[model samples]
Target chain A: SLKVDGFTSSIIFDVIRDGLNDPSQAKQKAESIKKANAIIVFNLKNKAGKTESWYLDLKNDGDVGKGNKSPKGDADIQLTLSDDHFQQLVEGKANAQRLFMTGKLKVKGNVMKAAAIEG
Target chain B: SLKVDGFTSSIIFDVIRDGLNDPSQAKQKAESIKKANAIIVFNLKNKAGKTESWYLDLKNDGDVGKGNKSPKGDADIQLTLSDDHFQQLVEGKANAQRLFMTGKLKVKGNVMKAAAIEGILKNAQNNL
Candidate 1:
């Protein structure tokens, strides 16, 4: 298994991490990386109550296989949620709109900017 | 308004930029500053589609409020998000777990140290 639990929100980083280094999901995530123009921020917490963050950068059509959240600067939107919830989101067990309205999900700007990540 | 550091030379965190500094928070954030012993990197973006990084070092009893796009070395945790989101996170509207499931928050390494940042995160709120 790819230790899917370690991923925080934005899940995009994990997505590419799997897509780039892993075999099964590599190309699949790279496809989305190609279309990505926005950056997502993850306020992540671990089982040990440790909190860390991961980011997704798609600016300049950055290569997902080699992409990282370094050189941090501009991004379109951001999400505030949980690690488990992000798993639910990736597993197709959660709903985006529901999380948004419940205040469990927060976006800095408009919702539309987040659209690119879903596709 | 508290002038919080953002690990940048001239760049300051939005906390003080908005003047939401709290004496209690300033003291608390300063103390919580010690609890963190890890490095967190933020991949932030502005509205214009530009991107950069913000580094947070809690490795010492130093300022956790600091972080510039470019720092000296590698980060223990990297956060790739937007400036708008950064403001919300500072405002305390963001939940760590809540953000994990929906937004793009990910990290790999000893995660407990940064957990202390959560303590600081709470103090960052615009408490009355």
Candidate 2:
């Protein structure tokens, strides 16, 4: 389920864990890391009125999944998106660039971290 | 050209002018006015270092097009967006609702005015 009680890199891992282990997807992720040393911090606003943040630290050390330490200080990319949109995004019904262009998706910090990985 | 020296409802009208004249699209716009007596005040920032605003007044009377005298006092719906994003948006390449959700689109006042046509205009553009 995309709905979450809190925000954490754990949730992102949950969403992509299976894909993370996929050898091809892992390679794509690795290539992305070479271009961007991404340490993503997601700030999500829930529908019911709670704001929370989580982190995804991709060191690309061949350790691509699970229990990454929360990124502290300024993140390489700080993303602000609503919970419902997050659900749509993970469900493959929305486009991040489209959302970003329209104003619903806010990005702060290094944007190289947002490399578009295709399906 | 999506680049604009200013943000006038006239530009929006330019993008959707033909549709505005169509009966179906006209009716859709009429209904939007019925549900929302919208006076959208767009505040835009350009990459070339300029900021300007324009108004789109949806009055029940026939003066519904562009050059709408800027809404005096408070506007019903106020929006803040960067100029480049605004360009993509009017050209049907962007989604206002998505941007609103992410904070790239900022809204103040009658938020429902935005909700009313957020999807309508996107769909209308395809037919246009």
Candidate 3:
């Protein structure tokens, strides 16, 4: 039972990216994430019936973009699922581990790296 | 004519990444590159009939890595060509702008950002 009230995958990505880049917000959490040294890609199937890609680079710096197009190449982890589930996943309502277990989420690349996405 | 000789795209990436990170080597050039604020991706079609990728970030720092994997996201520019042409382009034997003109190289994204590659290559050569 997750609330889709105000959260969209796009808004969530923007929020997370902005928060991580903010000097005064979640600064420590952002810095700690650098050690994860993994880049991730999200291919979310939106309500528009299209799979849109979003990329997060935790390797060098915390960079988030709308597309899986990074100068760094392929992501260490690429997760595919519905946009609503993605919002739920990051909002702590849905767990990728269990979601994947249920076949609601598809993971490409490193399964170990996917573990880092756990909230 | 570009000579394959002993140059491989992999070696160039390693050398460039190492040199840019090196304190005493091309120190000024490396530092100067940071102001460009552009990242570039090179997709080289190798002899094996497969395309390989290399990335350079002239944005935060002179970070160079294999593949188009960066947290900053999409490159300001992505150039596609053969591996030999890529080597020659970096080695100064081939010019990307003209190579692009002659159909030897393909460029995607901002042309203005692509311009930074010249300055980057200048520093990259100094590292060598």
Candidate 4:
């Protein structure tokens, strides 16, 4: 049995309703990360499968800002991109480091957490 | 005989009134560039020798934007810098390419004209 926690239930339902092509394996991957006590990585890939920017919000204990209306905390990570690079990420024509080195993407605090998220 | 033209008279007067340390040599440099038919390069360097960014407005027959209530034209060149790099330039701790390659400075259109501005500004910064 795989346990998916922390994410808002609505977000989870949306992920499920999208009919993730491989729910069984997806659940396992989710379980492994959850057990590691690692930072929760929300991978928001645009249509082209390019990771535009990764946002990291630190988690203290298992209670990582769940069910709190108007969540207020500094983003552990934040980045912005020009429109062209954003499209390329969605197209899978680029990767994080390539974008970062090229100045197309920028990384903020918690770089280690960012790497873990990418992993 | 030297002729300094095109620039708004007020701007020219301001430069002169500042009592530029070397007015005679400065006039010659300005005249030479003005005669080259090159794009007008406005170097707004902070107090540093480093060229922060050069602005290029196209000069058609020496009729660049001048003394109009609202001048309008595409900036042939435009670049911006972060506050830190700007300070470094003002303090004479950095150079143009060093700042640019390091991403502390940027350049826009008419690169050749931008280069010319660097040469001109080196002299001009003394006036400022």
Candidate 5:
């Protein structure tokens, strides 16, 4: 199962927005990713210290399936975290690659997307 | 009257904390600034689109007086804002000096602290 925890949806969106040269194209790409039968997951810790996991499945129809359960296969991208770490990422105080290298973020699949997601 | 309307307190505190070589010393300095009859103000916009102003008076005994008034003299520092601008500042996408030079931030008093705070903040940003 893939998971990303502790980051705000906005932060994740911002990284994608900045990393891509064109935001409109990026938005299109995001929608496309959702349509491709690809799986993306985010796990985060809220202020109350409870860990919450959110999943998105992108199929070829340009629709996104969001929920808490993995769809019985492998995830294309996985993100994991703690609340403080998520906050650091949003603040530009932490690097995702460094965190992954340090084992703070563990990825189980689609290492390419995980590597390129922030850049 | 001073106003600062768009950033989060945590972002401001982080800039200060990272800028100082010693956070403890910086905390002490923050208290000292509060104690010196100096005025520091921050204005920020909430998500609701309302502009809000916050003020603090630092007395010599490390006490802070907060309100919306100008405290009847000149302000030691004034920060002004819009919600988007404030968010950019907190996100490390904007620089105060650059904003000041561009006239996005207007300072009516205490130019010295305005410059020094960011210089120290830059160093802290680098260190952190």
Candidate 6:
């Protein structure tokens, strides 16, 4: 059940992008916002069993898109996991640290930076 | 130290590529080589703490290079681990399955194809 559709994932990332662009809650996330300036790629396995990558440009006021290649070229960190796990992460039902420790989440490049953004 | 220089890793991959191109030993590896048509990227942490990715083209007579991108485009699988762990893997001091089980090896993309190349990697290691 670790599968989700592209449309669902797209919508989820859209909301996250909106939250990042929101000025009303900027004060509350100031400290965390500092480290948000990073490019991250989430490679989620879809219902079809193929991996669907979602790129997050947390560096530039937040932007999200689908594909291995993003607008900014290379990503600072790439995370691979199940689509269900990714959804759970967005819904606060799962923790990145737990997923990572359980070996369900695979990270490539900049482990510390990945922790800062999604840990 | 779990870190090896780019030169060493580069040389290692070069040798592996040669073996794949060797016609003399092609008979023994025919079965496995049929499934060798895959692109794999190995991302290893260097001494400087930055990751250096090595791309392997097991699909086309075997070719290896250092970079995130390859001539053949996207990779079938991408593996991330420490440089030392990678060196150990190449030196036959480590096992891929064990590494995966221990969470030392991180895999992205097709897991089955990843297994197919392990034999190739190990076969190359025996020559070293």
Query: What docking tier does model 4 reach?
Result: incorrect
Write out the backbone clash pairs for model 3. A57-B71, A71-B68, A72-B67, A72-B68, A72-B69, A72-B70, A73-B67, A73-B68, A73-B69
- Candidate 3 Cα errors over 4 Å, as ranges: A1-119, B1-7, B25-30, B124-128
Whichever of 3 and 5 has more DockQ, that candidate is: 5
In order, what is each prediction's RMSD in angstroms? 17.3, 16.1, 17.4, 19.8, 14.1, 15.6
What is the TM-score of each predicted model, taking all chains together? Answer: 0.36, 0.39, 0.44, 0.29, 0.36, 0.43
Reference contacts reproduced by model 4: 0.00
Residue A117 CA displacement from its true place in model 1, Å: 2.6
Q: Pick the candidate with the highest TM-score.
A: 3
- What's model 5's overall lDDT? 0.50
Give model 1's DockQ, 2 decimals.
0.02
How far is A2's C-alpha from truth in model 5 (Å)? 16
Tell me the tens digit of each residue's lDDT in model 1 across B1-128: 11222322112233222212445455544554455545566666666676665555544433334454225446776766656565555434465555655764554555455445555544432222
lDDT of residue B16 for candidate 2: 42
Q: Residue-wise lDDT of candidate 4 within B46-97, one digit each (tens)?
A: 4343332222222332222222111444445564565444434433446767
2 versus 6: better lDDT goes to? 6
Report per-candidate DockQ. 0.02, 0.02, 0.01, 0.01, 0.04, 0.01
lDDT of 6 by residue, A1-119 (tens): 21235535456766765675578868644544455556788887766677777777766545567676568667866778877787787788998656865767766544234434643
Report the number of the highest-lDDT candidate. 3
What are the lDDT scores of the predictions, listed in order?
0.49, 0.54, 0.64, 0.39, 0.50, 0.63
Candidate 4 clash total? 4
Docking class of 2: incorrect
When summed lDDT is taken over every stretch of 10 residues in candidate 2 chain B, the lowest stretch is: B61-70
Per-residue accuracy of model 2 over A38-93 as CA lDDT, tens digit each? 56666788766777665555544423222213433335556678877776776779
Tens-place lDDT per residue, model 5, B22-44, is: 44445645544543446566566
Candidate 4: segments with Cα more than 4 A from true spot: A1-119, B1-26, B35-73, B125-128
